[PDB]
Each structure stands twice: as structure tokens, then as C-alpha cells.
Symmetry: none
Subunit: 245 residues, 2 copies
């Protein structure tokens, strides 16, 4: 059993700790703990995502990014949190600014913590891309350029990369598979499944199978809008999951 509920006291306490360590120009264990705690409490928990935004957490995110450009673990925690935020369709309009999009697009090239920062920046952008071109508006950079950079980032990642991530459910990723609005979002989502069933099959083959991923990946192979690179990863995931049974 579990309990995933918003708690303003959690969120406000964490942001206040962040703000203090930002004023101290100190990215120590408390600073990293604080962002990791925000990551934790937003995992499958939209109400804490909404609170993080409503207490102006994005300002602290940008200020920490500028102040601590080389603290890879810090960047990982922040982008994992933002990954959770972007899964909430109702909150993504708030991410559609040139200031924010330019950061996410730039982070696609980050080498911090293996691939986690680039991966989670790509997830944020994958959920954003899923909403379609009219949601993008006049944001800069342009959507077609960000898309090019997402393809490049996904192609640059070792499919057998070690990972500092956990999923209790694949359903935010699975919802990016049966659509043709954004093939690159579908490709990120398929890659996300392929990497995890490759490095942790004992955990993620059963989760993927239990949550109905096999028929969705079969549909991807039949889908005209799916790129052939995506179809081939889908075939390999189905294959690995089938042998795991």
C-alpha cells in the first residue's frame, strides 16, 4: 500500500531549503536531498507537481541550473522532478515558454549522470510534443529544431546504458505509443522501454506485460506514422518480453 497526496508543507519546506542553499551558493547534501525529495513526492502525484509550480519552483530550478552548472547529481534530481511535472497534461501549458523550452532543448546534450539529464529532458519534451504544434505557439527555439535535437539525443544513448531511474508504472510512457501526433515522442517512449527491459528485465518485462504493452508495441509495428527505427526497437522489446515468459 501507498499514499500519493499533495502536501504543501513538504513542497514549501523543500523549496525554502533550496532557496537558502542557493543564497549560500552551496550545493551540498541538503540541497541535493531537497530536489530528490521533490522528485520523490511528485512520482505519480500530480498534486505535488501543481504545488511545485504554484510556489514558483521553476525560478529555483533555473537559478540552481545557472549557479551550479557542473553538479551532475543536482541536475539529475531537478530534471527527474520536471519529468514528473511534464506528465501532467494540465500543467504543461506552464512549461510552454521560450525561457523553459530553450533550457529543456539545451539539456538534450547534457552528459550529466550518464544519460539521466538528457533522457529526462527528452521525456519532458516528449510529453510537450504530444500536445501538438499549436500548443508550442511562438516559443523559441522552433519546434522542428527541438525535434531534430530529440532524435539526435535518443540516437546517441547506449541502449544498454546503466540507469539511475525507477518506474512503478509505465502508463505515462505507454500513453505516448498509440498516437501519430509526435513520432519522436513515440520513439523516446519506445526507447525508454527497450533500455529498461534490456538492463532490468526481471522488473520491467513483467510491469510492461502486466500493463498491456505487448499489444501497443504490436500496433506500433503496424503504424504508418511510426518510424522504422521505432518499429525495430518495438520488435526487440516484444522479443525480449516474449522470451522472458
Amino acid at each position: 500500500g501507498f499514499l500519493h497526496v499533495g502536501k504543501m508543507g513538504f513542497v514549501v519546506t523543500m523549496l525554502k531549503l533550496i532557496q537558502k542553499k542557493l543564497l549560500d551558493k552551496t550545493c551540498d547534501q541538503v540541497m541535493e536531498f531537497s530536489w530528490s525529495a521533490l522528485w520523490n513526492i511528485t512520482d505519480e502525484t500530480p498534486d505535488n507537481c501543481e504545488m511545485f509550480l504554484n510556489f514558483n519552483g521553476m525560478k529555483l530550478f533555473l537559478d540552481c541550473l545557472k549557479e551550479f552548472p557542473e553538479k551532475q547529481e543536482l541536475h539529475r534530481n531537478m530534471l527527474g522532478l520536471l519529468g514528473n511535472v511534464a506528465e501532467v497534461k494540465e500543467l504543461r501549458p506552464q512549461l510552454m515558454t521560450s525561457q523553459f523550452i530553450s533550457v529543456f532543448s539545451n539539456l538534450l546534450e547534457s552528459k550529466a549522470d550518464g544519460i539521466e539529464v538528457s533522457y529526462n529532458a527528452c521525456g519532458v519534451l516528449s510529453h510537450i510534443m504530444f500536445d501538438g504544434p499549436e500548443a508550442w505557439g511562438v516559443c523559441e527555439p522552433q519546434r522542428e529544431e527541438v525535434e531534430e535535437r530529440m532524435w539526435a539525443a535518443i540516437q546517441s544513448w547506449d541502449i544498454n546504458s546503466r540507469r539511475n531511474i525507477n518506474y512503478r508504472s509505465f502508463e505515462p510512457i505507454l500513453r505516448l505509443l498509440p498516437q501519430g501526433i509526435s513520432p519522436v515522442s513515440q520513439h523516446w517512449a519506445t526507447w525508454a522501454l527497450y533500455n529498461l527491459v534490456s538492463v532490468y528485465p526481471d522488473k520491467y518485462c513483467p510491469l510492461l506485460i502486466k500493463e498491456g504493452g505487448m499489444p501497443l508495441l504490436r500496433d506500433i509495428i503496424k503504424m504508418a506514422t511510426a518510424r522504422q527505427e521505432t518499429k525495430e526497437m518495438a520488435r526487440k522489446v516484444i522479443e525480449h518480453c516474449s522470451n522472458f515468459k
Copy 2:
């Protein structure tokens, strides 16, 4: 998503913060967060449950109960965590002491966060009693006296309670249904299902059906060891799920 709890040593990070806040005699937001995180990351994750016990989380739990006897969310979070530990059969022998059993039994009367602490302590005892009187050593209080307190707690709860717990799967609760070793564990489990399908049928009716709950409930209705009131709840759960 979240980080890799294993690679990051995250369980110990939480227990270290707990210990520090304990010595500070401070149950603040961070202390509550730490126990809340432990509850959430032990859900269906036996290895995090074993990490908790191995690093003496039981003593931190007892010491926090003593130092913070009126902190309601804290007590709920700690007992939800222990509810997850208790679901792991291999770990339940570590709970069979007079010190631990007595604390679980006392908490059946707790009013903290509505019914949540009482319910979580009843769940821990329900899984413990599923193992039979052999597993109960000369542990004191007596097994039957705890059982009587369990029946009383369950009857006190509002069947229509809105709840501060959720389940990704009913399987730990459903395994308490097809057995006569502990009728009170069966009754707790039937109540848990009946409350959640009553109050949140859109989430929990499909889950219960999909996970095979209907044949288990029908077996209860025919079972010699299930009490009449357990059978009557089971019938209503079946009715609610069939009309769903």
C-alpha cells in the same frame, strides 16, 4: 518516476535523517517526509522492507512512537510502512516479539488520522495471524486476546470512510481470503475490499474483478470457518462489483 533507490542508498538516507530528527526531538516536515517516503518505496518492494529491518528501523519506529506519541501523520506513515513489511512472509518472523506485538495490538485503538493507524496495525496483525498459532510463540499478549481486539477495531470503523491509503494491487489482501487459519485476518481483508469498492468503485471494482477477487469472495460465502458477518460483507462486495 524516481531515482534508483538501491544504487543511491536511499532507504538508509531516510533512516539517517530519521535518527537525526529523533535525537533533535523534532518531528517536523522533513521527519514526516522521511517516513512517508519509506512507506511509499516499500510498497510491493520486499528488498526495501528488508533494508528497513536490517538497519534497525524497528527501533527507530519504537523510539518515534515514544518520543512523538501524538503526531498523527507520523504514526500513519510508520504503520503503513510496517504494513508493507508485514506483507513479506519471510520478514514476518522478525515481528514476532512481545514488544512488537504489544505495540501493534495497542494501536488498534488509535484515533490518529481517522481509522488509518488502527487499520494499518490491523493489517500487520492480519498477515501475522495468517501464519498460524505456531508462528505465535509464547508472544504476549495472547493470540486470542489480540484477535478479540482486532474484531472490535474492525467493527468500529465507518464502512463508508474515505481513505488515506491506496493499492496498486489487491493481491496481498486477496491471499487472506481463501483460508481458515485466521478468520479474523479474512474478515479484515473482506472489510478492506468492501470499504474501498463502496467508496471508490470506479478504481477498485475493476481491480478486484481483474485480480480474481470474485471467486475468492464466493468461496468465503460457502466456507465453514468464515463468520456470518464476513459472509454478508462478501455478498455485498460481489453485488457491488456485479452491478459495476
